[PDB]
Design a protein around this ligand. Structure first.
Ligand SMILES: *[C@@H]1O[C@H](CO)[C@@H](O)[C@H](O)[C@H]1NC(C)=O
Lengths: 145, 245, 65
C-alpha cells in the first residue's frame, strides 16, 4: 500500500514560502511537491515513495542548531493507497525554535523520514521537504531560551 | 580515593580493566566493592569527612543491594561535598537509584526496555555513532573522524539548566523502540548518549548510556574518547583558577 | 487561635535567632541549590515520606537548546 503525503501546515500569521529551493541528497526522493491556496489549512501535497514506513516522522526545525521537533502522522488506509497527514500548528511551537528563527535569518526546514529495519540499504527515505521562511515579527524580547 | 562498585551478575569487572589500569597507572587508589554477594555496607563518610574523592558505578541491575550502599540522599550529600560520579545505565540494566538520582539532577534517562534503534546505521549489528555528534570541545575535541561503538544503549531527556553539559548526541534519524506501545521516549537528536553535570561547587558527574562503551572489546574504537571523558569527570582536564582580581 | 497546620513550611529561609520573649525574629537567606533546582523541590523532597514513585512517565520538559 503505497503512501500519499500531505503536510497540513495550519498557521497563525504571514507563514512563509515553502519550497525545495536547492537540489539536495535525492535518496528515493519525493516524486513532486505541490501547494494549495486555502487559508485555514494551507495543505501541501507530495506523493513520494517509501519502501517500508515503519518509521514515519517529520522533523520541523533547524538541523544545524540541533533544534528539531518530531511530528507523527495520521494514516488512513483506503486499501489501495494510504494517506498520511501531518498537521503543524505554527502557534504551538517551541519558544526556543521561534526565537532562534526570528533572531537570525534562516528558514525552518522540514525533513521526512520513512524507514524500516527490514528495508534494503538506500531504500529508506530521509529528505528535506520544504524550507519555510517565517515573517511574523511576533517574538518575546526576554524568555528562558 | 576512587571507589568502584560492580555487580558480578550483570557484567564482570574484568571486561572493564584497561581503563581501570590506566587509572592505576596515574596514582588512583582504587577500592573495589562488589554488590552481588556482599552484606557489609561501605560508609562514604566517617564523622563528616568523605572517605573518597570519586566513585564509579559500573552496570548493575536494579535491586535492594544498591539502595543500601548508595541511597539517593547519600549520593546528593557526596555530590554537594565535591565528590565526582560516573554512572552507566544500559537498557535492561537501569537501576532505580541512579535513575532517581539523575532525575533530581535534570537528566531523565530512558527506563528499561527502551533501546535506541537507528536504521541508517554504518554497521547494522550494533549502534555505532560517528564523531560529528560531539558537542563540547572542552570535554573532548576529535582531531579526526571516529566511529564510537555504543552497543545497545539508552537516551536521556535534558532540561534547560546551566549545569548540564551535553557531550554526545544520538543520530538524527535514530529513535527509541519500546517493547510496549508507549510512545518513543526520545525522538531524534534530543536524546543524548553521554551527558555531564557540574555543580556550583565544581563537582562533576558523567552519565554514559551504554554498557559496551567502556568494555575491553571496543578498546580500539573508544580509547581516546573514554580516557578524555574520565579525565574530565575527575577534575583533571579543564579546571580553571582566577588569581589576583 | 493558631494551630500547627495553619502555618506552612518555609523552604527558602532559615531561622537563626529568636529573642527571649519571641519579639524579634531573625531569618537568613539560604544559598541556592548547587544542583540548580528550586528550593521548593528540595523541601518537598526532604518532607515527603519515602514511598514508591507513582510510575515512570515521560517528562513534559520542552526542547533543549
Ligand atoms: C554472586 O555470584 C554470582 C555471579 O557469578 C551471582 O549470580 C550470584 O547470585 C551470587 N552468589 C553466588 C553464590 O554465586
Amino acid at each position: 500500500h503505497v503512501s500519499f503525503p500531505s503536510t497540513a501546515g495550519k498557521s497563525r500569521v504571514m507563514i512563509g514560502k515553502v519550497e525545495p529551493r536547492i537540489g539536495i541528497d535525492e535518496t528515493v526522493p519525493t516524486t513532486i511537491t505541490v501547494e494549495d491556496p486555502n487559508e485555514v489549512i494551507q495543505v501541501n501535497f507530495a506523493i513520494e515513495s517509501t519502501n517500508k514506513p515503519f518509521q514515519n516522522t517529520l522533523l520541523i526545525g533547524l538541523p544545524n542548531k540541533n533544534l528539531e521537533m518530531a511530528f507523527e502522522p495520521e494514516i488512513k488506509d483506503n486499501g489501495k493507497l494510504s494517506m498520511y497527514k501531518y498537521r503543524i500548528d505554527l502557534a504551538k511551537l517551541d519558544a526556543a525554535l521561534l526565537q532562534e528563527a526570528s533572531r537570525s535569518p534562516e528558514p525552518i526546514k522540514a525533513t521526512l523520514i520513512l524507514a524500516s529495519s527490514t528495508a534494503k540499504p538506500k531504500e529508506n527515505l530521509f529528505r528535506e521537504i520544504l524550507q519555510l521562511n517565517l515573517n511574523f515579527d511576533v517574538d518575546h524580547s526576554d524568555s528562558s531560551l | 580515593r576512587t571507589l568502584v562498585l560492580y555487580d558480578q551478575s550483570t557484567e564482570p569487572l574484568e571486561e572493564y580493566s584497561v581503563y581501570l589500569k590506566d587509572l592505576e597507572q596515574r596514582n588512583y587508589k582504587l577500592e573495589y566493592l562488589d554488590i552481588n554477594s556482599t552484606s557489609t555496607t561501605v560508609d562514604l563518610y566517617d564523622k563528616e569527612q568523605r572517605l573518597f574523592d570519586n566513585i564509579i558505578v559500573f552496570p548493575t541491575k536494579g535491586g535492594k543491594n544498591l539502595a543500601r550502599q548508595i541511597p539517593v540522599k547519600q549520593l546528593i550529600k557526596f555530590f554537594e561535598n565535591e565528590g565526582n560520579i560516573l554512572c552507566m545505565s544500559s537498557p535492561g540494566a537501569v537501576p532505580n537509584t541512579i535513575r532517581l538520582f539523575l532525575n533530581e539532577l535534570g537528566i531523565y534517562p530512558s527506563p528499561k526496555g527502551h533501546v535506541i534503534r537507528d536504521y541508517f546505521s554504518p554497521s547494522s549489528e550494533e549502534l555505532v555513532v560517528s564523531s560529528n555528534h560531539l558537542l563540547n570541545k572542552y570535554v573532548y575535541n576529535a582531531r579526526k573522524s571516529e566511529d564510537f561503538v555504543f552497543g545497545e544503549s539508552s537516551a536521556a531527556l535534558l532540561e534547560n539548566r546551566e549545569q548540564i553539559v551535553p557531550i554526545l548526541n544520538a543520530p538524527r534519524t535514530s529513535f527509541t523502540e519500546s517493547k510496549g506501545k508507549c510512545n518513543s521516549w526520545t525522538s531524534g537528536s534530543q536524546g543524548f548518549l553521554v551527558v555531564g553535570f557540574q555543580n556550583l561547587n565544581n563537582a562533576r558527574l558523567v552519565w554514559i548510556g551504554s554498557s559496551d562503551f567502556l568494555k575491553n572489546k571496543n578498546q580500539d574504537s573508544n580509547q581516546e574518547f573514554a580516557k578524555e571523558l574520565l579525565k574530565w569527570t575527575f577534575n583533571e582536564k579543564s579546571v580553571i583558577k582566577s588569581v589576583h582580581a | 487561635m493558631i494551630t500547627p497546620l495553619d502555618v506552612p513550611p518555609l523552604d527558602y529561609f532559615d531561622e537563626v535567632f529568636t529573642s527571649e520573649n519571641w519579639m524579634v525574629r531573625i531569618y537568613q537567606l539560604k544559598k541556592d541549590d548547587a544542583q540548580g533546582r528550586t528550593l521548593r523541590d528540595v523541601g518537598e523532597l526532604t518532607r515527603s515520606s519515602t514511598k514508591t514513585r507513582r510510575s515512570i512517565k515521560r517528562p513534559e520538559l520542552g526542547l533543549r537548546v
